[PDB]
From a paper:
LpxA and LpxD are functionally and structurally similar, sharing a homotrimer architecture and conserved active site features, especially in the acyl-chain binding pockets that reside in the dimer interface of the β-helix trimer core. Herein we report the discovery of several small molecules that bind to both P. aeruginosa LpxA and LpxD with μM affinity, identified using a targeted structure-based methodology that utilizes molecular docking, surface plasmon resonance (SPR) bioanalysis, and high-resolution X-ray crystallography.
For compound 1, the complex structure with LpxA was solved at 2.10 Å resolution. Two modes of binding conformations can be identified in terms of the relative location of the carboxyl group, with minor variations in the positioning of the carboxyl group seen within each bind mode. In the first binding mode (exemplified by pose 1), the carboxyl group is within hydrogen bonding distance to the Gln157 main chain and His156 side chain. In the other binding mode (exemplified by pose 2), the ligand’s carboxyl group is positioned near the Gln157 side chain, forming a hydrogen bond. The rest of compound 1, including the carbonyl group and the naphthalene ring, is placed identically in all poses. Notable intermolecular interactions include a hydrogen bond between the carbonyl oxygen and the Gly151 main chain. Additionally, the naphthalene ring forms multiple non-polar interactions with residues His118, Asn133, Val132, Ala136, Ala138, and Met169. Among these, Met169 is the so-called “hydrocarbon ruler” that ensures the length of the incoming acyl chain substrate is no longer than 10 carbon atoms. Aside from the acyl-chain binding pocket, compound 1 was found in a second binding pocket outside the active site at the dimer interface, where a second copy of the substrate UDP-GlcNAc was also identified in the previously published LpxA-substrate complex structure. The naphthalene ring of compound 1 forms non-polar interactions with Leu3, Gly23 and Pro24, whereas the carboxyl group establishes favorable electrostatic interactions with Arg57.
Numbering used by the authors:
A (entry chain A): 1 to 258
B (entry chain B): 2 to 258
C (entry chain C): 3 to 258
Write the structure that this text describes.
Amino acid sequence: MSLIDPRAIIDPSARLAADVQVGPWSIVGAEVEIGEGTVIGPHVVLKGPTKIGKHNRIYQFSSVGEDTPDLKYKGEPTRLVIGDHNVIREGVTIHRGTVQDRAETTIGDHNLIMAYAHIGHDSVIGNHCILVNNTALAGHVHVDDWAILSGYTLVHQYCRIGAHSFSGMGSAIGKDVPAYVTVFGNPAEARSMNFEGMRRRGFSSEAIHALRRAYKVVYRQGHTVEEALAELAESAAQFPEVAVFRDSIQSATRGITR
Amino acid sequence: SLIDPRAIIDPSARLAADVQVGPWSIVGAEVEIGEGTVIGPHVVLKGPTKIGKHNRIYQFSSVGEDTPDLKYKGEPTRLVIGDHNVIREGVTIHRGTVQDRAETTIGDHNLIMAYAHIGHDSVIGNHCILVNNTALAGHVHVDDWAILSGYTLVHQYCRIGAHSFSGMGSAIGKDVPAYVTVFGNPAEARSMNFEGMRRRGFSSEAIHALRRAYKVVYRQGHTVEEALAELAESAAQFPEVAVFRDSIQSATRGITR
Amino acid sequence: LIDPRAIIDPSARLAADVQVGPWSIVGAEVEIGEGTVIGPHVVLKGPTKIGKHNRIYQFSSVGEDTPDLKYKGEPTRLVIGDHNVIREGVTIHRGTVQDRAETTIGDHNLIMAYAHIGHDSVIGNHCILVNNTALAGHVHVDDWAILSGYTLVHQYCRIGAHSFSGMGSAIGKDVPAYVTVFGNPAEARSMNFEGMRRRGFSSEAIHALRRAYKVVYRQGHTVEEALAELAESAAQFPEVAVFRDSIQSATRGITR
Ligand SMILES: O=C(O)CCC(=O)c1cccc2ccccc12
Ligand SMILES: O=C(O)CCC(=O)c1cccc2ccccc12
Ligand SMILES: O=C(O)CCC(=O)c1cccc2ccccc12
Ligand SMILES: O=C(O)CCC(=O)c1cccc2ccccc12
């Protein structure tokens, strides 16, 4: 399934794999590597150094592997790494790393990035995440697996979005969102847990109840987070699902969304 | 000539004789374009899609793409746009899903401003304005003359009533009755669009009957069941109040309060 | 320098070393100054002047007509100065005859991806408009202002020198010089001291502006009493005169 439209500009240092497609008026820039079966639409701008894995799909008007704009981050080389089976919709902007942080922006596998979403310098996205239309990761954002950020979710620099978490549309996130937690509003506020997400992805009823207890332990009982960690220790040893919640509290860099 | 020679026209596309297409635009398989329509440069049209007459579609617009929505599995769904519409810079419009009616529908005399998004299965009527970055998530019904201010977000299945108004940055999760003004995240009911009613030449008598109708729904501690009973009389007298009352009766997600 | 896949209207006015990328349009009555790089997939429309050492990124539409129902095809203008960065998919509309028939941008401005500069807006120098910031129309942004991501500004609002909006701010009244605003609707929080240090303000000016803020926001004064009370400090510190003038010139009212 290989088709390179001759109206595309492929840099001589660019590398295409088996069954790669590139649509008309797209740019595949110097030091861009595209893996097996990846389909690039028309009017795409790819810049490097960038590595894209297998069976990805990048839509028109997207700018993937651009430099972060503030000419105060003005160092090179900086990397973008994209895994496999990712969908990047119309007009998505993805920026490479900065030498004054990770020197890399990282995206894993099976992610859906919907139209006009922004992924800022040095962000890390895991696997099976959904960033709905116009979601903006300001920079240095960590989104763990199965997270869903609803349309127009803004995320401040350095925030961690926990596994299976959920933001409502127009949420503005200024602190870490623990794993499984649902946040709404500007500024973002914890509501409940993504119980629906746990169910759809086959979480045991015991796991789900231990996470309902785990939520109370952290949010409702007036405990210091050290007190909360010690309280969760046992349920965390029983339930890998609770340990994921505990780990997100523990590693929270400047507080949790309350 | 009127079709730029740097444009890609699929052989299966049907274009009325005076249609213009700018350079580096794509008119995909099973795209129909009616008389007097101008497609600018850098436009992607995908089908199956019917665009009517005297429309204008600006650079960087994606009209007729598949929804990324997980429940779409490549079914042969449709997009219909009527006549006299303006689609500005970078607008996205997605085709329908078979789970609903298999069609995204836009009417006539609509102004859809830059980076607006019209989600799978949405229905827009006539003379609507979607300001910059308005996003209809999917299955959204926007009735005639509705104005959605910039960065207005609309949840799946919401109904936006005729002559309604949203303030900028409004996040709508519940239905907006006809005539109602909503503001904020989450959206809150403030009043009725009296400025829009006067702009359209409504009668003093119809405006007054709608002023009183708002009070009955929103300011008398009535349940909606009770409010609907109380509106029956004035709804029987005034078509404008019938439209308001019908929008509440048809408000499946509940009404914005 | 001019990619042969670009379209340059004959009536365009490109200076010696201007670069235009592939599949970009430099339309009629579009002037571009020395050292300016037009990226690929850019649309320029005129009447428009673009100064020197500018960078305009892909999928930008610079100089389009406002879709505003009050515009009607008149030959309104867009003027951009020097050393500006206009990022991916930015929209800049030309003016209307209802105001000064001109949209204006000064020097050293950073306008990030999908930002919108509506008809008749006036941006000064060394401003940052972060991603998806929107100036609805007739918005004045004075020098060194920072508007964070998805800041929305209602028509006619003035954004004062060194002011700061937090992400998702929705501004419906003027923001005085130096003031930090957040939320929808925007509310005043504090002053932009990081901005004052970035400018090498003396601690004396920074202390005077710290005082000036309290006099306006924290001492239950009316604007007029605040303006009267600020005359001493304003006559002494130009920095405070900037604060004071920005409140004096807000006949709409100030973000509270
Ligand atoms: O069809 C898509 O939208 C994805 C791949 C693509 O853009 C493409 C690849 C090769 C040749 C083409 C000729 C015309 C239009 C698109 C293409
Ligand atoms: O279900 C929820 O809570 C929000 C739904 C939502 O954010 C969404 C979904 C799909 C496409 C969209 C496009 C634009 C804006 C929002 C969306
Ligand atoms: O709080 C912070 O750290 C971010 C401040 C902000 O709004 C921002 C800054 C830089 C790039 C961005 C891209 C998209 C959205 C927001 C931003
Ligand atoms: O807020 C006002 O002053 C007008 C209402 C509005 O939302 C608007 C109007 C025109 C262009 C716009 C561009 C971007 C965002 C908002 C607008």
